[PDB]
């Protein structure tokens, strides 16, 4: 008669690593790395992202005519933008401090666009002739929808003195611009005056823009340049414009309302008609694992990203052959 001490074995095939030994077969193990996503861009927590597709944040905010899909967009959870969007800056130029703006946007879930200076508000200036074949809409020379390309009337550009006051309680993103012609005669044809300026002031802004003439390459069949500037106008603050030409004046500006958690994802993926609690630029994650190896940039309640191919904890004992 005989009694023995012993331990469990089973048919388990699961292996874990240790410092001294690799691929130790164990009776039980817990995998803690999520390796799977659904390869789709999905609504986050019910709330649909803003998917620009072709349009850039610039093409969207300035109101590129091909970006009409985004004239008025609802509260979004996150923004998706391609690597090299086609519909941005239709008329070539620059967007001043663009990245600082993109950054401001990452802490914003909802914009509400309101008219600040009406197009039919320019008594002394031609406001329906500021168009270009660089920005076509339905086959016809058009222009950025939210700004107005002011042009000479009866052969005069009177000094503009316009001023908007932010009576709204919500911060306001005001955008404007300046046109840089390519020679002396273009200045004459468009604005009459040969030397000009746009001065812009708020309680904290002290700006004076002066057009730079230079001969340059035809980007989009254009040698002229537009340069766009922005500010954030506080509540109870006023923005004062003064210009005698080259002025791209605000028509609309965005009230900043929601101020949500958010990111701009870079992805060449289109909307996937799904919902998730954790989204990556490659696809969404539905998992209870502590870690995942999908992509570093995520939004939501997410597992921690690591670079591993494999994370498995032993729970049972060395399984015997």
């Amino acid at each position: 008669d005989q009694i023995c001490i012993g331990y469990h074995a089973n048919n388990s095939t699961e292996q874990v690593d240790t410092i001294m030994e690799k691929n130790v077969t164990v009776t039980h193990a817990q995998d803690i790395l999520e390796k799977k996503h659904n390869g789709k861009l999905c609504d986050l927590d019910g709330v649909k992202p803003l998917i620009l597709r072709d349009c850039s944040v610039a093409g969207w905010l300035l109101g590129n005519p091909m970006c009409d899909e985004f004239i008025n967009v609802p509260e979004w959870s996150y923004i998706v933008e391609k690597a090299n969007p086609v519909n941005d800056l239709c008329y070539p130029g620059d967007f001043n401090d663009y990245e600082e703006l993109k950054h401001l946007l990452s802490r914003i879930n909802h914009f509400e666009k309101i008219q600040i200076i009406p197009k039919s508000s320019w008594s002394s200036h031609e406001a329906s002739l500021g168009v270009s074949s660089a920005c076509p809409y339905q086959g016809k020379s058009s222009f950025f929808r939210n700004v107005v390309w002011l042009i000479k009337k009866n052969s005069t550009y009177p000094t503009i003195k316009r001023s908007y006051n932010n009576t709204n309680q919500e911060d306001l993103l005001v955008l404007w611009g300046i046109h840089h012609p390519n020679d002396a005669a273009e200045q004459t044809k468009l604005y009459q005056n040969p030397t000009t300026y746009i001065s812009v002031g708020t309680s904290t802004l002290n700006q004076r823009l002066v057009p730079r003439i230079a001969t340059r390459s035809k980007v989009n069949g254009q040698s002229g340049r537009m340069e766009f500037f922005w500010t954030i106008l506080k509540p109870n603050d006023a923005i004062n414009f003064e210009s005698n030409g080259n002025f791209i004046a605000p028509e609309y500006a965005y009230k900043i309302v929601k101020k949500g958690d958010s990111t701009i994802m870079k992805s060449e993926l289109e909307y996937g008609n799904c919902n998730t609690k954790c989204q990556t630029p490659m696809g969404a994650i539905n998992s209870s694992m502590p870690f995942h190896n999908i992509h570093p940039l995520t939004i939501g309640e997410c597992p921690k990203y690591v670079k591993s191919n494999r994370l498995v904890l032993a729970t049972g004992l060395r399984n015997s052959p």
Partner: protein, 158 residues
């Protein structure tokens, strides 16, 4: 393994013991079979569960990458930004992979320890009463019946 029981003096585990992690096989005139030692098994289930939760939890505060964009003449800070994000992701990957490696080795040894402690607990009781066979087994000098066997398991021999 450090404690010499698992795949040590106890050559291999028991497919026939589904009841728990460690226990006894008995064999006498009335028959034979397996019986999981409930408390050492439970102590082990607690240990491993707490460990996993400690492990998961310790790792919950951990570097989150934030998308950040730079223009064409901001290459130095873009690179700094990149080297920073990658740098933390490498530190955490290493932290995670190593913690797993070390604790896996500690878990396996823990099981070995629990088997050895159980073995010794039984060895202590048997005394001159049984021959210690060398293989995990004790062969009785006299005639152990099922309640004799039960008495060993329960901890009240002699």
């Amino acid at each position: 393994g450090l404690f010499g029981a698992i795949a040590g003096f106890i050559e291999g585990g028991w497919q026939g013991m589904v009841d728990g992690w460690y226990g006894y096989h008995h064999s006498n005139e009335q028959g034979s079979g397996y019986a999981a030692d409930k408390e050492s098994t439970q102590k082990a289930i607690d240990g491993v569960t707490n460990k996993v939760n400690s492990i998961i939890d310790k790792m919950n505060t951990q570097f989150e990458a934030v998308g950040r964009e730079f223009n064409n003449l901001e290459r130095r800070i873009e690179n700094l930004n990149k080297k920073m994000e990658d740098g933390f992701l490498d530190v955490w990957t290493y932290n995670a992979e190593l913690l797993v490696l070390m604790e896996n080795e500690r878990t396996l040894d823990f099981h070995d320890s629990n088997v050895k402690n159980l073995y010794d607990k039984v060895r202590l009781q048997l005394r001159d009463n049984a021959k210690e066979l060398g293989n995990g087994c004790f062969e009785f000098y006299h005639k152990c019946d099922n309640e004799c066997m039960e008495s060993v398991r329960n901890g009240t021999y002699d």
